[PDB]
Design a protein around this ligand. Structure first.
Ligand code: CL
Ligand code: CL
Ligand code: CL
Ligand code: CL
Length: 199
């Protein structure tokens, strides 16, 4: 099957998250996602079809993981726009506060906003996560792990958390009232020796 940013994957046939970005490591295929999405060795399906398992993760403290993917599957260096098309990923140049950014994930789809803060600590129940970047694109439960990227194709990070309301998302309040937090992609690629797939 095809591995594409923002699409749904299941963990141990029990929970759902969203693909961050296709990557390679040596001759191994994979994708980056959030560390809170599963433990090491947990089995990942895309389409109800098994593609691999969590190879490594850090959560809390950080919130990062990568999933290794079998050689028979096809990595696309792109992110789904949730309207039948894709946005090409071209690199991982980090954007500054005030820059436009979008995200993609299986609960709220493709949503856009701006970068609003850096170096934010989230106090999650399982522990604090430091160094997160904040934007004001909306998101909801299930978007976790999904792509954050600029329109020009620069990968920014993977969805970590934020100020979800009673409905499970923060799309029911204006952007000015949102905190949507992502883990920067650069340190994930560096820690695990991963190369971003581009197109
Ligand atoms: Cl491939
Ligand atoms: Cl900045
Ligand atoms: Cl929490
Ligand atoms: Cl980064």
């Amino acid at each position: 099957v095809n591995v594409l940013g923002g699409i749904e994957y299941s963990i141990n046939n029990a929970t759902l998250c969203s693909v961050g970005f296709s990557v390679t490591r040596g001759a191994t295929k994979g994708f980056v996602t959030a560390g809170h999405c599963g433990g090491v060795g947990a089995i990942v399906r895309i389409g109800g079809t098994q593609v691999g398992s969590f190879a490594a993760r850090v959560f809390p403290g950080n919130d990062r993981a990568w999933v290794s993917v079998g050689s028979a599957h096809t990595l696309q260096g792109a992110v789904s726009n949730y309207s039948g098309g894709t946005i090409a990923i071209r690199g991982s140049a980090e954007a500054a506060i005030g820059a436009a950014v979008c995200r993609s994930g299986r609960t709220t789809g493709y949503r856009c906003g701006n970068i609003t803060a850096k170096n934010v600590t989230a106090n999650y129940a399982e522990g604090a996560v430091r160094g997160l970047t904040q934007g004001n694109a909306c998101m909801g439960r299930g978007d976790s792990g999904g792509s954050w990227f600029t329109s020009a194709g620069q990968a920014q990070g993977v969805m970590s958390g934020g100020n979800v309301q009673s409905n499970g998302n923060n799309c029911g309040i204006p952007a000015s009232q949102r905190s949507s937090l992502f883990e920067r992609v650069g340190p994930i690629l560096s820690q695990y020796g991963l190369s971003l797939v581009t197109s």
